[model samples]
Target chain A: IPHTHAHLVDAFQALGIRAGQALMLHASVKAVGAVMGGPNVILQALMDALTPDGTLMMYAGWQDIPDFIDSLPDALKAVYLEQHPPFDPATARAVRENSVLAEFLRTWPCVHRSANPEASMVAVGRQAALLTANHALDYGYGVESPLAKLVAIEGYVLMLGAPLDTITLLHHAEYLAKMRHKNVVRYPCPILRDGRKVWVTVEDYDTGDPHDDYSFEQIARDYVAQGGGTRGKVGDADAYLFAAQDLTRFAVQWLESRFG
Target chain B: IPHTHAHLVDAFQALGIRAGQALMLHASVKAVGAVMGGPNVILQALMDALTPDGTLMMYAGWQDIPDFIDSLPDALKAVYLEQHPPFDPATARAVRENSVLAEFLRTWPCVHRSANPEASMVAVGRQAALLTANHALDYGYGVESPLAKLVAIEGYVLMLGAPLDTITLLHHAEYLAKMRHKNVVRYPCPILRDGRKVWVTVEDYDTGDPHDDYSFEQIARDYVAQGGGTRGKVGDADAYLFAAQDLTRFAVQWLESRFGD
Candidate 1:
């Protein structure tokens, strides 16, 4: 049996999503099973439930071949610098290798994509500009980042049966964690400046899971144990909705207590 | 070495693609391999080389869950007709199972997609409008279909290392093939009409590869053997460019000769 728009609308409302709410989503469409119309029904349901007044955001980061090539011989890096087309948010596809839903949102009309090409995101709603503007190339998951702005504007993270570690909002917590031995990563990336392609050194907290012991999924599951968010079902999948500001605050404390 | 935009442009030019050529493409992006920027590098290079005047078209048929679904019980069919949203071109996706490039073109700005939901196509360029407009649901691959219009507007089919049987223009030839035991298929599909969701029975020549012995790949390879098209390499991929009119005419004759009444 396929889930209909009305069924989804009822599920969303039951899960405490109301009109005019800002939401960042991590979703696995297949987990929802057969939707009546198409996989697009998920977005439509979110849009209808959120209405035009609310905003929907997704992690639409472009594919990164540059970062992994950090230690490539300078000769090849020079080739990359000259030949690579500078990241154009207008056309650069969302990292589909992560989630197909991300690219779907990236193509939706009236959506805005942030500029930090490597850690880019797309937002749809009245606050789309506010959420996606001025994304810094450095500290992409840190202060004043779109995740930070999402925290600022009182948003929620909706995990539509995506994996537990898919909570990207927790990266914001990792950046704010005041712990010694916090690692930093630097790499070269290209952006258009003054009508020319220029390669620049980009700095940020080591985003890769290098902590050796802790996982973001552990923090989220623990947070859920303490009743930090709402839990429900969406279609055939398990759904979790966490308050961004509250969870990020809790994640920071959790990291400090462990890593400190 | 990863193929750069300049490298791709050079390849397109070498393969005789210039500004303002109406071209329908069947491509396997990975077959070209190691594009510098991303997979999108192909579209941009094609865009840069075509310069907005040339119309680029690809088969963007929507996913069909309805046609193979014709034999369903009336009880369940009633459930589908009620709960199902009409096929919306604006939001309905291209048949991604066939090609991801189709969806890429669908996302391209100022592009147009034809209305026949099951056989839809996306077109980019000045003639995108003329190519995609008034796509009839019936005989979708026949007269006045996008394939027919491609022939009418003097288009060529570009094969970017796609398989030989992937020549969809041959379906146009199949429809024009006058033969005994010709088959037609009818199935119910939904569309928005008079502001209401209505299920319409659609009729089209059976599109499935039902000819027991013959294969479209065989026909296309035969055409190539006859030296009927341009052949070259675009990137590391084998590329073929066939005049749509010449190929379709040849295909019709081949089918007629074998299956004549």
Candidate 2:
């Protein structure tokens, strides 16, 4: 049976997504099986589940990030670098080819998007302003971002039928971890400067290195084993709900103990 | 029975360590109960097990490594820095207070010691010179060191009752891993520059990061689960033997997949 908005709400409730609670959600729209009214229906059901006082959040990474300048053809490289569009959260589309749910959420009226060019996050509701404010370009996932605010506000992470690897909260965990060998990388990204195009340096963790991938599968399973999460089904897809603060705190400590 | 040279050889054979195989060993003599001729007897037995064709390696870290000069006591800081002993591998004692085995190994007549001031490695046998040559100051455990040579030689790592955490091969794994946020640390150490003692800066991965305490327990367990090692008794202590190349290859890939950014 195709899931109605009511069924979605019931699934959220079953997974313990309380009304008025702040949430960061990661989902696969198609993975939720069939929906009665498509993506909007699912988004509306989430807002209903969260209610007016609550807030909803999702990562809205830029879709058309260009390759390194050196990799481009020599004749066109300069033109491409000079003519690339500045990152504008207000108009820039999220990487919907991989995450249609994120596109729908970011386009929702009244949602505020963070200013980070590559690692932007979109949100809506009472705490949206608080969550997306003062995002630093470097360490985009660290203390100054919405992720930290989510932990500070003691929010919840709602993974609706998404892979365990999609728990974006672990990015926050990575920022919090004190590793012996922390990898770093630098790249140029186009951004607005006095209403003109400008390429700014973005130096942060080496997100490209495959070894740097956080093991969310084992981490989430361990979190549940440690008695910290609620698991259930959401429209034929597996769902997991965790207290944001608890998950980050446990993960940081777990990372320290295991890696150190 | 207290372990003698014969008993040690028997234990090595039991763990599948044979003649003509290169080996990197981590051991605790006391933990292995009592040895009839002490650490030397155990070392001798290992040589016998590997024969003249095989090589044996062990880390011989410096005994004293005081931190930055600015952090030292006010009156003694300058004097301490000026008077610090120059790193001379030939004369420097291995950190025997903790690793008696390393002390014995380094003092062995034919062992070749790497030139690294802080993190020297000593080796014996056919590949000794190849393993210990060209030790870089930074990333002491990296590709240029004896650790990498162990992998190149398709060697074996034999642990004799040491805690799983003491597996030094993981240090090589750290160097090989491509971390997204790989941490770097800077400090000062005394070195021989133009035959005079001078404080030179040293920088490398923060091998001391509390979170980077290699996940050897789990990594080793998984390796064993994947049918990758030989386990048995060495003296009164548990022994684990693994193909050095295989363990390192597995660990490097595992670290990247689990912790990469």
Candidate 3:
């Protein structure tokens, strides 16, 4: 049996999803089983579940191609950087699982996207403007970023069949961890600067990569087991919801004590 | 090297794809290799090559899923059919290879989609209205259909690195074949009827599934070898162009001789 829009909405509302809320969602269409209208239906359901006043957001980051260039010969990397596709919010695709959903939102009417290539985001509805209004390029996941803005707006994150490890909101917590000799990394990405696609090196707290043996999944599971979030099922898939502010606080305390 | 709009346009024009000509395209984005902006860039190039005056048409047939429910137990079939998702052109996916291109065009501003879902066609241009104005559900590829209208407008078909076997224009020839004992098939599809979704049965010539032993590839190869189509390269993809009218005529004649009993 195919899950219809109403079914999905009811399922979501049953799990404490409310109207007029700011939300970040990570999802897997496959785990949701058969849907009446596929991803479109799921997206529409998310909207109807929250209505227009509720802002819908996703961490639809840019392609990971630029990350490997740091290992290349500087000369070879220079040529690649020169020729690489520049980040255009309208045209640039979202990296990883957010690809399709982000593309749908891109084509969707009146959507806002962040400017940071590696850690971009897309949002629509009441708070979309404020959420994406001040996305800084440097330390893309730090304070003054969309993740920070999400917490400012008291946003909630929905892990709709998406992996616990895939919740990108933790990176903001990592950025907030008070330490002088913290992990930092730099990489080049082509950006449209005054109508020209040129290479720009961005430096940020090493969000992932090595991570110094810290596991995001460990933090996520610990928080859930310790009763920090809501959990339920939506169409045979494991569903989770968390207050972004609460999760980030827990993640910050977890990261600060464990590392540095 | 990625092919830009200019590069693709030059390659297209080099193979006789001119401005202001209605063109049907079957494509292989993978075969086209590294493109500047991917499929969107190619679609843009195709439009730039033809301009707005020239119509761009594609046969984006509906899902073939409804074909098999005919064999289920009557009650089971009824239950299944009642809840089947109806067609919504905006959300409807084009079956198989035509999926991506059709979706892009559907989302494209000011594009038109045909009402008949089975042999649906989408067109965007000066003559899109005349091209898809009357796509009859009965024998959808026959007279009054987009394929026949393609010929009326002197349209051309470009095999943009697509396999010859996947050519759908041959189905029009299948409909046009001068034989009475031709095969026919029927299937039900859900559609909105006066705002309520309902299943409507559509019957048409069995274009494929059972061709009684015929090869679309052979006819395509023979036509190309006989100097019937223009061939060139569009960014490493083996591009070929043919007048849809002439190709249909050749295909119709080929079918008539082989299957005419």
- Each candidate's TM vs. the true structure? 0.49, 0.50, 0.49
Of candidates 2 and 1, the better by DockQ: 2
Q: Residues A52-122, candidate 3, lDDT per residue (tens digit)?
A: 86889887787654767878899988877777778887788777567477667656677888888888888
- DockQ for model 3 equals 0.01
Over the stretch B62-97, how does candidate 3's per-residue lDDT look in tens digits?
Answer: 764466678999998887787667887667778776
| Cα distance off (Å), candidate 3, residue A59 | 63
How well is each residue in A182-218 modelled by candidate 2, as lDDT tens digits? 5555566788778887876675655544223357777
Per-candidate Cα lDDT values, in order, are: 0.83, 0.80, 0.81
For model 1, the superposed segments whose C-alpha errors exceed 4 Å read A1-260
Best-fitting candidate, measured by TM-score? 2
> Order the candidates by TM-score, highest first — what do you get?
2, 1, 3
Residues A1-260, model 1: lDDT tens digits: 89999999889989989887789999998888889987678988988899886889999887753665557788986777777777777888888755788988999988888878888989888557657865779999987478987886678999998998989898899888887677888887778776677788889888786453689889998999998899899999899998999999999999889886
Give me the displacement of residue B125 in model 1, in angstroms. 0.3
Error of 1 at A176 (Å): 64
Model 3 regions more than 4 Å off: A1-260
CAPRI-style class, candidate 3: incorrect
